[PDB]
């Protein structure tokens, strides 16, 4: 039972490390969007 519950707590830490990477994928995808707006403000300055 102690081996069966060591493996359970190992899976529960894998779920936290899975959700840390999923929240970082959604964060970098939002940083790619604001950088796409920073480039459009640099093309309008190029037009200016």
């Amino acid at each position: 039972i102690s081996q069966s519950e060591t493996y359970r707590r190992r899976r529960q830490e894998w779920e936290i490390q899975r959700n840390n990477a999923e929240a970082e994928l959604k964060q970098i995808d939002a940083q790619l969007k604001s950088l796409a707006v920073r480039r459009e403000a640099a093309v309008l300055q190029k037009t200016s």
Partner: protein, 48 residues
Amino acid sequence: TQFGSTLQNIIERQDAEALNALLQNQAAELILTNLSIQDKTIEELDAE
């Protein structure tokens, strides 16, 4: 001579007012581009 000095004054005032009307039509064009860059600054802060 007095007609020629008067005509020289009018041409200088003509080219000084034709330049100032050019400087305000150019300043009214750059304000449209700088007001579009500010739209991309607010759109960035909604993306941040």
